[PDB]
Amino acid sequence: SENDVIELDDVANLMFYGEGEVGDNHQKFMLIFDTGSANLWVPSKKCNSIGCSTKHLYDSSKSKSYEKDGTKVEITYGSGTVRGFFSKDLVTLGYLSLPYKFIEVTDTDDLEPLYTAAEFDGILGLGWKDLSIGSIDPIVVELKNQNKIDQALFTFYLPVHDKHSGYLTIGGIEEKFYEGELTYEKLNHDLFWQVDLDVNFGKTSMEKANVIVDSGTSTITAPTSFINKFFKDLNVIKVPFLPFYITTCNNKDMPTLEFKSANNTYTLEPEYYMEPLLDIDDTLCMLYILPVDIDKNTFILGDPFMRKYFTVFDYDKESIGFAVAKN
Numbered sequence: 001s002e003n004d005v006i007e008l009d010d011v012a013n014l015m016f017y018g019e020g021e022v023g024d025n026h027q028k029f030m031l032i033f034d035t036g037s038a039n040l041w042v043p044s045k046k047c048n049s050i051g052c053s054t055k056h057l058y059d060s061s062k063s064k065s066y067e068k069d070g071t072k073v074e075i076t077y078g079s080g081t082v083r084g085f086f087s088k089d090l091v092t093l094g095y096l097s098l099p100y101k102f103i104e105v106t107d108t109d110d111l112e113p114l115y116t117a118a119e120f121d122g123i124l125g126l127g128w129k130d131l132s133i134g135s136i137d138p139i140v141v142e143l144k145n146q147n148k149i150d151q152a153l154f155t156f157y158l159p160v161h162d163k164h165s166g167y168l169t170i171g172g173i174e175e176k177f178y179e180g181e182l183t184y185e186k187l188n189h190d191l192f193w194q195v196d197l198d199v200n201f202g203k204t205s206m207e208k209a210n211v212i213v214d215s216g217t218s219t220i221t222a223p224t225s226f227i228n229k230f231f232k233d234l235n236v237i238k239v240p241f242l243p244f245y246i247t248t249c250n251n252k253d254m255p256t257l258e259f260k261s262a263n264n265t266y267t268l269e270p271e272y273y274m275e276p277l278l279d280i281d282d283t284l285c286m287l288y289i290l291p292v293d294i295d296k297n298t299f300i301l302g303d304p305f306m307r308k309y310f311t312v313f314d315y316d317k318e319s320i321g322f323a324v325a326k327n
């Protein structure tokens with residue numbers, strides 16, 4: 001279908017960006033499509049933070065569809081906070097264009113050390129309205145609306161590394177991406193793309209958790225409590241300075257990660273969470289799991305899942321589809 005296709009391109013590590021232009025002159029920007037935030041921002045030219053130094057900056061004169069706002073405002077992401085001011089210009093996603101409301105970022109340092117360390121300029125959120133600061137209607141909701149796409153949904157198709165290329169699709173399920181039949185889960189709320197699921201990490205488990213599907217992060221997380229029990233099981237090693245738990249890859253005895261719907265069951269093998277350390281030899285591994293304390297029953301599923309499962313987000317259907325991806 002007229003299904004806009006956005007190419008996610010990954011970068012040495014394992015995080016992906018996508019092209020993004022704002023305005024008549026079509027200034028280009030490496031963003032981050034994220035189902036965890038619900039805003040959009042681009043480091044504005046009127047920024048001078050070191051961060052911005054080596055970064056694509058947005059400049060407004062240059063266009064004339066730039067409508068002015070200047071209302072000052074900020075966002076406090078999990079790993080930092082940003083400051084600037086709303087602006088409204090033309091935001092375009094390859095095939096599709098659109099006049100939208102975004103934040104012109106001025107003061108970063110903070111998202112910092114991060115912000116420079118990462119091959120990215122901005123973030124385009126893909127969450128629900130209530131998750132956004134300033135109550136802004138999720139683009140996809142608001143293309144569907146202007147009837148410029150079939151329906152309100154987006155798909156995240158994820159591959160691997162050397163292998164191939166990520167693919168964000170807006171407006172339709174493309175079977176070119178998955179294997180088997182799709183199963184869905186209905187959102188427990190319209191904030192994040194959160195759904196109710198029963199969760200086992202191998203042996204240690206938690207029932208009726210709140211799980212959410214975060215295209216933005218590259219990790220999988222869970223309440224620390226829940227981890228401790230798990231980590232201790234397979235004797236993991238947390239070296240202070242390094243921020244990841246390491247462990248033997250060939251671990252005779254390798255648990256999978258269970259995610260149970262009433263009548264669906266989603267699993268994640270040990271290979272979809274682990275990474276050699278060290279790139280010469282597969283003795284030690286780095287895990288993609290980390291203890292974070294959002295709530296007491298809140299988990300987060302980032303790339304690691306979507307690498308395996310082609311995922312579908314349906315605004316109207318007020319739900320999310322799951323299915324195994326093509327390779």
Ligand SMILES: Cc1ccccc1CNC(=O)[C@H]1N(C(=O)[C@@H](O)[C@H](Cc2ccccc2)NC(=O)c2cccc(O)c2C)CSC1(C)C
Pocket residue numbers: 034035036037038075076077078079080131133214215216217218219221292294300
């Ligand atoms: C997984 C995790 C947990 C806690 C802190 C950081 C991270 C890693 N975050 C990431 O990889 C990236 N982000 C993401 O993946 C985002 O989806 C982030 C995920 C999240 C959800 C609930 C609690 C805390 C964080 N969410 C938010 O930042 C967030 C969530 C709710 C409201 C809101 O105004 C924001 C900005 C935000 S930018 C980022 C590059 C930091």
